[PDB]
Design an enzyme around this catalytic site. Structure first.
Site, PDB file in Angstrom:
ATOM      1  N   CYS A  15       0.996  -1.467  -0.064  1.00 24.63           N
ATOM      2  CA  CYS A  15       0.066   0.161  -0.305  1.00 24.63           C
ATOM      3  C   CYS A  15       0.871   1.509   0.218  1.00 24.63           C
ATOM      4  CB  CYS A  15      -0.746   0.093   1.317  1.00 24.63           C
ATOM      5  SG  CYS A  15      -1.968   1.892   1.171  1.00 24.63           S
ATOM      6  N   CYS A  29       0.116   4.598   2.679  1.00 30.57           N
ATOM      7  CA  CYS A  29       0.855   3.930   3.887  1.00 30.57           C
ATOM      8  C   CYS A  29       2.788   4.366   4.426  1.00 30.57           C
ATOM      9  CB  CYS A  29       0.948   2.525   3.991  1.00 30.57           C
ATOM     10  SG  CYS A  29      -0.440   1.838   4.411  1.00 30.57           S
TER      11      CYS A  29
END
Lengths: 110, 110
Positions: free
Chosen positions: B34, B37
């Protein structure tokens, strides 16, 4: 290797059953913590099963096989890729209904 | 262990360092696949560090800790929970900037 719908077991398993598949492939990126995967999962499964070898479904658990998610640039779950001859040729993210899935699979198969 | 910012190692580690903490806790559900993140992660880390013990940061990789994301009903990443005396008292999903992260931590700390 009798079933048209299967869990991807490792790195080599992906290379033989997806990248080097002889039929078109739907790749389902999923996780146990994601609600909409529990609906989309079985739905797509039965639809692919009904095609009897014209399309296969490779299920990839994103927690078990974090490398494959990294490689395929999956940013969210559920992500489904259409693949043919190693190439990614269509994609959706999220839940689809049965008319939507039929349209996606007919676009891939012919 | 002396750091206010730490990786959650297992189930018992969560019970000790989050559920039974005597300071408020920010819980960062993240994944290596991700993108967002990689922004939010170090941004939160730095801001928690600057509070010197007034708030703790527990990082939880969701692929290494599927149980915890099921328990806390995490559906996507980044999910950040604010926790106090065993209980979830605030939540966000996605990236925030430094002004917004400042407000979130002032609401939790006082």
């Amino acid at each position: 290797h009798g079933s048209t719908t299967f869990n991807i077991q490792d790195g080599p398993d992906f290379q033989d059953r997806v990248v080097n598949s002889e039929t078109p492939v739907v790749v389902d990126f999923h996780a146990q913590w994601c609600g909409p995967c529990k609906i989309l999962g079985p739905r797509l499964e039965k639809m692919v099963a009904k095609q009897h070898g014209k399309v296969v479904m490779a299920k990839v658990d994103i927690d078990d096989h974090t490398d494959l998610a990294i490689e395929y640039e999956v940013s969210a779950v559920p992500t489904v890729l259409a693949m043919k001859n190693g190439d990614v040729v269509d994609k959706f993210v999220g839940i689809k209904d049965e008319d939507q899935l039929e349209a996606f699979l007919k676009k891939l198969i012919g």
